[PDB]
Amino acid sequence: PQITLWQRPLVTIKIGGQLKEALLDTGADDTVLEEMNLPGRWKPKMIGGIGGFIKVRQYDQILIEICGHKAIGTVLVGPTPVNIIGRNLLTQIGCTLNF
Amino acid sequence: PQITLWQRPLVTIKIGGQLKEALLDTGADDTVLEEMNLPGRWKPKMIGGIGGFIKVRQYDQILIEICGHKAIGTVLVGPTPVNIIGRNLLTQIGCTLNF
Numbered sequence A, B: 001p002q003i004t005l006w007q008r009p010l011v012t013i014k015i016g017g018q019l020k021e022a023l024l025d026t027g028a029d030d031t032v033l034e035e036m037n038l039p040g041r042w043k044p045k046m047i048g049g050i051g052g053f054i055k056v057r058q059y060d061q062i063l064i065e066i067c068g069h070k071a072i073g074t075v076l077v078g079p080t081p082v083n084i085i086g087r088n089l090l091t092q093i094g095c096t097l098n099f
């Protein structure tokens, strides 16, 4: 689809068997999801944004379905205020900015 | 133009007579720029992101030229780590997401 930006660009995702909403976020390098139950091993990581840093769990080779498009990649899980789909997954579903 | 997301979507802006680079950020409601010299009155505001809040100065009806497109609107100025162009200005230059 084409998405204008008069509202937040929220989409439905399926990850770890669960349905969630997430923001398509071109300003995010990585994908960061609110605390949730994912299986398997992970590695600690710290990421920074406008107000400081947060500690997240890094999961690799995670399957995520984003508005009906499948992608596999790294997902960070931790105390983000909003679920974010970052460029690591936006590139895999073919997402572009246009003006 | 059309912009893919394999790199950060950075663009040149002109604001307050000064040239800067900024991220086209669909995950940002508002536009937030690093400390800089702007003329005129402003109002204090606090905004939140991944790691907490920051205090910014809110300037209204500011002219900004974003990759050669003029827009007028609110610009927030404060300790953001990156210049961000948010949806309040992205809508005025006709920017869309596509996949």
Ligand SMILES: CC(C)CN(C[C@@H](O)[C@H](Cc1ccc(F)cc1)NC(=O)O[C@H]1[C@H]2CO[C@H]3OC[C@@H]1[C@H]3C2)S(=O)(=O)c1ccc2nc(NC3CC3)sc2c1
Binding pocket: A025, A026, A027, A028, A029, A030, A031, A032, A047, A048, A049, A050, A081, A082, A084, A086, B025, B026, B027, B028, B029, B030, B031, B032, B047, B048, B049, B050, B082, B084, B086
């Ligand atoms: C540069 C910065 C923009 C990146 N952020 C992406 C922006 O899109 C965030 C998304 C957001 C929305 C709401 C919210 F509550 C919190 C965050 N928006 C944001 O702060 O906006 C603020 C501000 C704008 O006006 C209003 O609208 C939303 C909210 C409010 C005030 S990030 O989330 O910090 C990020 C994400 C992924 C990532 N991956 C990394 N990987 C390391 C490098 C390898 S670093 C890293 C950092």
